[PDB]
Amino acid sequence: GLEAVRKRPGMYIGSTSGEGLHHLVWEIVDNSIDEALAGFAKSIQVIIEPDDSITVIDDGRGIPVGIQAKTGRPAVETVFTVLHGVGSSVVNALSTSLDVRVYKDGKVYYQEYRRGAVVDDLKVIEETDRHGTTVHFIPDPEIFTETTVYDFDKLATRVRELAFLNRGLHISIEDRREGQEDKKEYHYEGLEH
Ligand SMILES: CCc1[nH]c2nc(Sc3cnc4c(c3)N(O)C=CC4)nc(N3CC[C@@H](N)C3)c2c1Cl
């Protein structure tokens, strides 16, 4: 399974250089874009955290949390743990840690993984009035041996392109790193223009 991804990351993300590091962001963001395409997500936030980890927040329906007959596991766990808009488990495998929060039906469902391995069963941790999915991951320096430092301009350039290609979407990029905090928000208008 995912152990193959950790041993041959070049086959899954193309490169283990800075290019692969940035590719991880797109693998998660693309899933949020798919949920905007489905018609449910209206806004996506991408955040470079102070430690060069990444948080992606959308306001779509939330990844399904029900048990699948086929697997006996919650659908959300399978998304992150089974190799397959199909790249989430690759990002998981190539991260020291990934945590997912699903905001759905008034509850927050939470699961975390370490180098792709499940920490604990999906659990309800809070109540909520919002809906959507939040994925946070810390890229693995064992994999990304050249650099684990994000390029805000590189991310922002593509976020702007994604806003344009998905006209109507609100999408932002935020840098929370020391001495360089910044945020750019993009939204191209539809027929309301
Ligand atoms: C924050 C990133 C994100 N947001 C996400 N939001 C959703 S929301 C969603 C998607 N598909 C369905 C549903 C929600 N629901 O509620 C019912 C049937 C299908 N799904 C997700 N999945 C499901 C399959 C894969 N594309 C990743 C994601 C992912 Cl990953």
PDB file of C-alpha atoms and ligand atoms in Angstrom:
ATOM      1  CA  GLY A   1       0.000   0.000   0.000  1.00  0.00           C
ATOM      2  CA  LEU A   2       1.200   3.452   1.074  1.00  0.00           C
ATOM      3  CA  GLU A   3       4.556   2.060   2.148  1.00  0.00           C
ATOM      4  CA  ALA A   4       5.357   1.887  -1.602  1.00  0.00           C
ATOM      5  CA  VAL A   5       4.682   5.651  -1.855  1.00  0.00           C
ATOM      6  CA  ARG A   6       7.186   6.390   0.941  1.00  0.00           C
ATOM      7  CA  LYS A   7       9.860   4.266  -0.759  1.00  0.00           C
ATOM      8  CA  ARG A   8       9.236   5.466  -4.314  1.00  0.00           C
ATOM      9  CA  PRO A   9       7.879   9.031  -3.882  1.00  0.00           C
ATOM     10  CA  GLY A  10       9.254  10.002  -7.323  1.00  0.00           C
ATOM     11  CA  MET A  11       6.672   7.705  -8.981  1.00  0.00           C
ATOM     12  CA  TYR A  12       3.762   9.415  -7.194  1.00  0.00           C
ATOM     13  CA  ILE A  13       4.665  13.089  -6.978  1.00  0.00           C
ATOM     14  CA  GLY A  14       7.178  13.428  -9.769  1.00  0.00           C
ATOM     15  CA  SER A  15       9.952  14.885  -7.661  1.00  0.00           C
ATOM     16  CA  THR A  16      11.165  15.032  -4.097  1.00  0.00           C
ATOM     17  CA  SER A  17      12.634  18.514  -4.648  1.00  0.00           C
ATOM     18  CA  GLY A  18      10.809  21.809  -3.932  1.00  0.00           C
ATOM     19  CA  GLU A  19       8.578  20.962  -6.920  1.00  0.00           C
ATOM     20  CA  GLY A  20       7.240  17.826  -5.165  1.00  0.00           C
ATOM     21  CA  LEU A  21       6.860  19.750  -1.902  1.00  0.00           C
ATOM     22  CA  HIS A  22       4.537  22.235  -3.653  1.00  0.00           C
ATOM     23  CA  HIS A  23       2.764  19.415  -5.481  1.00  0.00           C
ATOM     24  CA  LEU A  24       1.482  18.179  -2.110  1.00  0.00           C
ATOM     25  CA  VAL A  25      -0.522  21.389  -1.702  1.00  0.00           C
ATOM     26  CA  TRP A  26      -2.183  20.909  -5.117  1.00  0.00           C
ATOM     27  CA  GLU A  27      -3.078  17.316  -4.391  1.00  0.00           C
ATOM     28  CA  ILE A  28      -5.159  18.498  -1.397  1.00  0.00           C
ATOM     29  CA  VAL A  29      -6.435  21.742  -3.002  1.00  0.00           C
ATOM     30  CA  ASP A  30      -7.589  19.813  -6.091  1.00  0.00           C
ATOM     31  CA  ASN A  31      -9.946  17.797  -3.890  1.00  0.00           C
ATOM     32  CA  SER A  32     -11.460  21.027  -2.513  1.00  0.00           C
ATOM     33  CA  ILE A  33     -11.777  22.326  -6.098  1.00  0.00           C
ATOM     34  CA  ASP A  34     -13.674  19.139  -6.995  1.00  0.00           C
ATOM     35  CA  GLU A  35     -16.133  19.905  -4.197  1.00  0.00           C
ATOM     36  CA  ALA A  36     -16.532  23.472  -5.508  1.00  0.00           C
ATOM     37  CA  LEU A  37     -17.187  21.891  -8.935  1.00  0.00           C
ATOM     38  CA  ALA A  38     -19.844  19.636  -7.364  1.00  0.00           C
ATOM     39  CA  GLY A  39     -21.443  22.953  -6.322  1.00  0.00           C
ATOM     40  CA  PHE A  40     -21.034  22.850  -2.554  1.00  0.00           C
ATOM     41  CA  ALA A  41     -17.689  24.497  -1.716  1.00  0.00           C
ATOM     42  CA  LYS A  42     -17.647  28.310  -2.122  1.00  0.00           C
ATOM     43  CA  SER A  43     -14.384  29.223  -0.432  1.00  0.00           C
ATOM     44  CA  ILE A  44     -10.973  27.620   0.015  1.00  0.00           C
ATOM     45  CA  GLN A  45      -8.176  28.829   2.287  1.00  0.00           C
ATOM     46  CA  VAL A  46      -4.575  27.700   1.903  1.00  0.00           C
ATOM     47  CA  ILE A  47      -2.319  28.544   4.851  1.00  0.00           C
ATOM     48  CA  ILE A  48       1.455  28.214   5.193  1.00  0.00           C
ATOM     49  CA  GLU A  49       1.757  27.739   8.956  1.00  0.00           C
ATOM     50  CA  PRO A  50       4.729  29.181  10.926  1.00  0.00           C
ATOM     51  CA  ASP A  51       6.503  25.789  10.817  1.00  0.00           C
ATOM     52  CA  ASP A  52       6.134  25.331   6.997  1.00  0.00           C
ATOM     53  CA  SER A  53       3.178  22.979   7.514  1.00  0.00           C
ATOM     54  CA  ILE A  54       0.078  23.465   5.345  1.00  0.00           C
ATOM     55  CA  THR A  55      -3.592  23.901   6.244  1.00  0.00           C
ATOM     56  CA  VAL A  56      -6.335  23.681   3.576  1.00  0.00           C
ATOM     57  CA  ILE A  57      -9.851  24.699   4.665  1.00  0.00           C
ATOM     58  CA  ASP A  58     -12.972  24.390   2.510  1.00  0.00           C
ATOM     59  CA  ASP A  59     -16.654  24.879   3.205  1.00  0.00           C
ATOM     60  CA  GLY A  60     -18.033  21.999   1.169  1.00  0.00           C
ATOM     61  CA  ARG A  61     -20.144  19.138   2.454  1.00  0.00           C
ATOM     62  CA  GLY A  62     -17.340  17.449   4.381  1.00  0.00           C
ATOM     63  CA  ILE A  63     -15.735  14.152   3.344  1.00  0.00           C
ATOM     64  CA  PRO A  64     -18.182  11.275   3.986  1.00  0.00           C
ATOM     65  CA  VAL A  65     -17.670   9.744   7.437  1.00  0.00           C
ATOM     66  CA  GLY A  66     -19.920   6.713   7.172  1.00  0.00           C
ATOM     67  CA  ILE A  67     -18.701   3.117   7.357  1.00  0.00           C
ATOM     68  CA  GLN A  68     -18.253   1.550   3.911  1.00  0.00           C
ATOM     69  CA  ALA A  69     -19.540  -2.027   3.521  1.00  0.00           C
ATOM     70  CA  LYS A  70     -16.519  -2.961   1.439  1.00  0.00           C
ATOM     71  CA  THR A  71     -13.848  -1.819   3.899  1.00  0.00           C
ATOM     72  CA  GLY A  72     -15.598  -1.768   7.282  1.00  0.00           C
ATOM     73  CA  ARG A  73     -13.924   1.634   7.804  1.00  0.00           C
ATOM     74  CA  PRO A  74     -15.208   5.262   7.668  1.00  0.00           C
ATOM     75  CA  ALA A  75     -15.019   6.648   4.108  1.00  0.00           C
ATOM     76  CA  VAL A  76     -12.790   9.532   5.282  1.00  0.00           C
ATOM     77  CA  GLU A  77     -10.171   7.099   6.697  1.00  0.00           C
ATOM     78  CA  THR A  78     -10.045   5.233   3.370  1.00  0.00           C
ATOM     79  CA  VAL A  79      -9.460   8.542   1.534  1.00  0.00           C
ATOM     80  CA  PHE A  80      -6.220   9.055   3.472  1.00  0.00           C
ATOM     81  CA  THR A  81      -4.998   5.472   3.953  1.00  0.00           C
ATOM     82  CA  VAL A  82      -5.695   3.660   0.671  1.00  0.00           C
ATOM     83  CA  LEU A  83      -3.821   4.319  -2.566  1.00  0.00           C
ATOM     84  CA  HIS A  84      -6.191   5.394  -5.359  1.00  0.00           C
ATOM     85  CA  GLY A  85      -8.819  14.139  -6.871  1.00  0.00           C
ATOM     86  CA  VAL A  86      -7.197  10.820  -5.823  1.00  0.00           C
ATOM     87  CA  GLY A  87      -3.989  12.066  -4.206  1.00  0.00           C
ATOM     88  CA  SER A  88      -4.924  12.560  -0.540  1.00  0.00           C
ATOM     89  CA  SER A  89      -3.354   9.277   0.612  1.00  0.00           C
ATOM     90  CA  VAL A  90      -0.125  10.190  -1.240  1.00  0.00           C
ATOM     91  CA  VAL A  91       0.077  13.481   0.704  1.00  0.00           C
ATOM     92  CA  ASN A  92      -0.614  11.496   3.880  1.00  0.00           C
ATOM     93  CA  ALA A  93       2.150   8.966   3.143  1.00  0.00           C
ATOM     94  CA  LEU A  94       4.722  11.734   2.482  1.00  0.00           C
ATOM     95  CA  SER A  95       3.893  13.734   5.636  1.00  0.00           C
ATOM     96  CA  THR A  96       5.260  13.315   9.175  1.00  0.00           C
ATOM     97  CA  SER A  97       1.691  13.987  10.273  1.00  0.00           C
ATOM     98  CA  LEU A  98      -1.654  14.764   8.716  1.00  0.00           C
ATOM     99  CA  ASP A  99      -4.853  15.632  10.570  1.00  0.00           C
ATOM    100  CA  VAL A 100      -8.316  15.883   9.071  1.00  0.00           C
ATOM    101  CA  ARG A 101     -11.382  17.578  10.540  1.00  0.00           C
ATOM    102  CA  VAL A 102     -14.772  16.997   8.912  1.00  0.00           C
ATOM    103  CA  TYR A 103     -17.535  19.459   9.820  1.00  0.00           C
ATOM    104  CA  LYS A 104     -20.808  17.702   9.090  1.00  0.00           C
ATOM    105  CA  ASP A 105     -24.284  17.290  10.599  1.00  0.00           C
ATOM    106  CA  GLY A 106     -23.408  19.518  13.560  1.00  0.00           C
ATOM    107  CA  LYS A 107     -20.342  17.457  14.539  1.00  0.00           C
ATOM    108  CA  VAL A 108     -16.566  17.670  14.009  1.00  0.00           C
ATOM    109  CA  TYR A 109     -15.048  14.305  13.092  1.00  0.00           C
ATOM    110  CA  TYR A 110     -11.306  14.030  13.592  1.00  0.00           C
ATOM    111  CA  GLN A 111      -8.566  11.609  12.589  1.00  0.00           C
ATOM    112  CA  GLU A 112      -4.786  11.887  12.491  1.00  0.00           C
ATOM    113  CA  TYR A 113      -2.047   9.853  10.796  1.00  0.00           C
ATOM    114  CA  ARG A 114       1.740   9.670  11.265  1.00  0.00           C
ATOM    115  CA  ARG A 115       3.864   8.909   8.174  1.00  0.00           C
ATOM    116  CA  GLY A 116       0.661   7.519   6.677  1.00  0.00           C
ATOM    117  CA  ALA A 117      -0.291   5.268   9.622  1.00  0.00           C
ATOM    118  CA  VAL A 118      -3.582   5.736  11.489  1.00  0.00           C
ATOM    119  CA  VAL A 119      -3.289   7.106  15.045  1.00  0.00           C
ATOM    120  CA  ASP A 120      -6.802   6.308  16.280  1.00  0.00           C
ATOM    121  CA  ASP A 121     -10.305   5.604  14.998  1.00  0.00           C
ATOM    122  CA  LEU A 122     -12.305   8.571  13.691  1.00  0.00           C
ATOM    123  CA  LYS A 123     -13.834  10.406  16.660  1.00  0.00           C
ATOM    124  CA  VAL A 124     -16.327  13.215  17.214  1.00  0.00           C
ATOM    125  CA  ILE A 125     -14.337  15.889  19.051  1.00  0.00           C
ATOM    126  CA  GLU A 126     -16.637  18.945  19.022  1.00  0.00           C
ATOM    127  CA  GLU A 127     -20.011  20.238  17.904  1.00  0.00           C
ATOM    128  CA  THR A 128     -20.213  22.745  15.066  1.00  0.00           C
ATOM    129  CA  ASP A 129     -22.536  24.886  12.982  1.00  0.00           C
ATOM    130  CA  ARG A 130     -20.344  24.881   9.901  1.00  0.00           C
ATOM    131  CA  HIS A 131     -19.723  22.344   7.138  1.00  0.00           C
ATOM    132  CA  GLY A 132     -16.579  21.502   5.239  1.00  0.00           C
ATOM    133  CA  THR A 133     -13.238  19.772   5.412  1.00  0.00           C
ATOM    134  CA  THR A 134      -9.956  20.907   6.958  1.00  0.00           C
ATOM    135  CA  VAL A 135      -6.710  19.080   6.139  1.00  0.00           C
ATOM    136  CA  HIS A 136      -3.407  19.979   7.801  1.00  0.00           C
ATOM    137  CA  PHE A 137      -0.139  18.268   6.960  1.00  0.00           C
ATOM    138  CA  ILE A 138       3.568  18.533   7.794  1.00  0.00           C
ATOM    139  CA  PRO A 139       5.673  17.380   4.814  1.00  0.00           C
ATOM    140  CA  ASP A 140       8.263  14.737   5.757  1.00  0.00           C
ATOM    141  CA  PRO A 141      11.897  15.974   5.643  1.00  0.00           C
ATOM    142  CA  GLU A 142      12.917  12.289   5.307  1.00  0.00           C
ATOM    143  CA  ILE A 143      11.255  12.499   1.894  1.00  0.00           C
ATOM    144  CA  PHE A 144      11.846  16.164   1.027  1.00  0.00           C
ATOM    145  CA  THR A 145      15.558  16.169   1.786  1.00  0.00           C
ATOM    146  CA  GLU A 146      16.407  19.188  -0.426  1.00  0.00           C
ATOM    147  CA  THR A 147      13.912  21.651   1.094  1.00  0.00           C
ATOM    148  CA  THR A 148      10.792  21.715   3.258  1.00  0.00           C
ATOM    149  CA  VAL A 149      10.435  25.510   2.901  1.00  0.00           C
ATOM    150  CA  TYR A 150       7.385  26.815   0.981  1.00  0.00           C
ATOM    151  CA  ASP A 151       7.472  29.549  -1.650  1.00  0.00           C
ATOM    152  CA  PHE A 152       4.566  31.956  -1.012  1.00  0.00           C
ATOM    153  CA  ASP A 153       4.844  33.633  -4.448  1.00  0.00           C
ATOM    154  CA  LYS A 154       4.785  30.209  -6.198  1.00  0.00           C
ATOM    155  CA  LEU A 155       1.671  29.162  -4.261  1.00  0.00           C
ATOM    156  CA  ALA A 156      -0.028  32.536  -4.738  1.00  0.00           C
ATOM    157  CA  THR A 157       0.608  32.479  -8.497  1.00  0.00           C
ATOM    158  CA  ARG A 158      -1.164  29.132  -8.870  1.00  0.00           C
ATOM    159  CA  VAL A 159      -3.944  30.037  -6.395  1.00  0.00           C
ATOM    160  CA  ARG A 160      -4.702  33.076  -8.604  1.00  0.00           C
ATOM    161  CA  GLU A 161      -4.733  30.800 -11.698  1.00  0.00           C
ATOM    162  CA  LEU A 162      -7.098  28.386  -9.923  1.00  0.00           C
ATOM    163  CA  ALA A 163      -9.461  31.251  -8.981  1.00  0.00           C
ATOM    164  CA  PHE A 164      -9.554  32.278 -12.649  1.00  0.00           C
ATOM    165  CA  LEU A 165     -10.099  28.727 -13.962  1.00  0.00           C
ATOM    166  CA  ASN A 166     -12.819  28.215 -11.362  1.00  0.00           C
ATOM    167  CA  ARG A 167     -14.537  31.574 -11.832  1.00  0.00           C
ATOM    168  CA  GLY A 168     -16.870  32.244  -8.896  1.00  0.00           C
ATOM    169  CA  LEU A 169     -14.667  30.473  -6.350  1.00  0.00           C
ATOM    170  CA  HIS A 170     -13.208  32.395  -3.443  1.00  0.00           C
ATOM    171  CA  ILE A 171      -9.674  31.172  -2.821  1.00  0.00           C
ATOM    172  CA  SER A 172      -6.950  32.654  -0.621  1.00  0.00           C
ATOM    173  CA  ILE A 173      -3.308  32.021   0.250  1.00  0.00           C
ATOM    174  CA  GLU A 174      -1.846  33.061   3.627  1.00  0.00           C
ATOM    175  CA  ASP A 175       1.701  33.079   4.954  1.00  0.00           C
ATOM    176  CA  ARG A 176       1.965  32.916   8.760  1.00  0.00           C
ATOM    177  CA  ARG A 177       5.763  32.604   8.860  1.00  0.00           C
ATOM    178  CA  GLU A 178       7.873  34.951  11.013  1.00  0.00           C
ATOM    179  CA  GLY A 179       8.649  38.410   9.531  1.00  0.00           C
ATOM    180  CA  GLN A 180       6.758  37.817   6.273  1.00  0.00           C
ATOM    181  CA  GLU A 181       3.084  37.412   7.173  1.00  0.00           C
ATOM    182  CA  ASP A 182       0.914  38.065   4.115  1.00  0.00           C
ATOM    183  CA  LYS A 183      -2.476  37.111   2.657  1.00  0.00           C
ATOM    184  CA  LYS A 184      -3.865  37.342  -0.862  1.00  0.00           C
ATOM    185  CA  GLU A 185      -7.539  36.675  -1.638  1.00  0.00           C
ATOM    186  CA  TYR A 186      -8.801  35.921  -5.148  1.00  0.00           C
ATOM    187  CA  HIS A 187     -12.313  35.894  -6.572  1.00  0.00           C
ATOM    188  CA  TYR A 188     -13.374  36.299 -10.169  1.00  0.00           C
ATOM    189  CA  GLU A 189     -17.047  37.225 -10.526  1.00  0.00           C
ATOM    190  CA  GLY A 190     -19.663  35.226 -12.424  1.00  0.00           C
ATOM    191  CA  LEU A 191     -22.908  36.532 -13.961  1.00  0.00           C
ATOM    192  CA  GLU A 192     -23.407  38.993 -11.070  1.00  0.00           C
ATOM    193  CA  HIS A 193     -20.559  41.115 -12.528  1.00  0.00           C
TER     194      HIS A 193
HETATM  195  C1  LIG B   1      -9.823  19.642   2.346  1.00  0.00           C
HETATM  196  C2  LIG B   1      -9.602  18.729   1.155  1.00  0.00           C
HETATM  197  C3  LIG B   1     -10.880  17.999   0.845  1.00  0.00           C
HETATM  198  N1  LIG B   1     -12.142  18.487   0.901  1.00  0.00           N
HETATM  199  C4  LIG B   1     -13.058  17.547   0.576  1.00  0.00           C
HETATM  200  N2  LIG B   1     -14.395  17.615   0.506  1.00  0.00           N
HETATM  201  C5  LIG B   1     -15.148  16.556   0.170  1.00  0.00           C
HETATM  202  S1  LIG B   1     -16.813  16.806   0.253  1.00  0.00           S
HETATM  203  C6  LIG B   1     -17.694  15.515  -0.417  1.00  0.00           C
HETATM  204  C7  LIG B   1     -17.249  14.831  -1.553  1.00  0.00           C
HETATM  205  N3  LIG B   1     -17.938  13.816  -2.103  1.00  0.00           N
HETATM  206  C8  LIG B   1     -19.111  13.422  -1.548  1.00  0.00           C
HETATM  207  C9  LIG B   1     -19.629  14.119  -0.343  1.00  0.00           C
HETATM  208  C10 LIG B   1     -18.891  15.164   0.199  1.00  0.00           C
HETATM  209  N4  LIG B   1     -20.859  13.704   0.222  1.00  0.00           N
HETATM  210  O1  LIG B   1     -21.374  14.375   1.380  1.00  0.00           O
HETATM  211  C11 LIG B   1     -21.542  12.689  -0.341  1.00  0.00           C
HETATM  212  C12 LIG B   1     -21.065  12.019  -1.472  1.00  0.00           C
HETATM  213  C13 LIG B   1     -19.861  12.378  -2.084  1.00  0.00           C
HETATM  214  N5  LIG B   1     -14.642  15.343  -0.162  1.00  0.00           N
HETATM  215  C14 LIG B   1     -13.317  15.093  -0.151  1.00  0.00           C
HETATM  216  N6  LIG B   1     -12.912  13.840  -0.619  1.00  0.00           N
HETATM  217  C15 LIG B   1     -13.878  12.772  -0.892  1.00  0.00           C
HETATM  218  C16 LIG B   1     -13.196  12.016  -2.034  1.00  0.00           C
HETATM  219  C17 LIG B   1     -11.909  12.748  -2.409  1.00  0.00           C
HETATM  220  N7  LIG B   1     -12.156  13.579  -3.587  1.00  0.00           N
HETATM  221  C18 LIG B   1     -11.584  13.604  -1.181  1.00  0.00           C
HETATM  222  C19 LIG B   1     -12.434  16.250   0.222  1.00  0.00           C
HETATM  223  C20 LIG B   1     -11.026  16.603   0.419  1.00  0.00           C
HETATM  224 CL1  LIG B   1      -9.605  15.468   0.302  1.00  0.00          CL
END
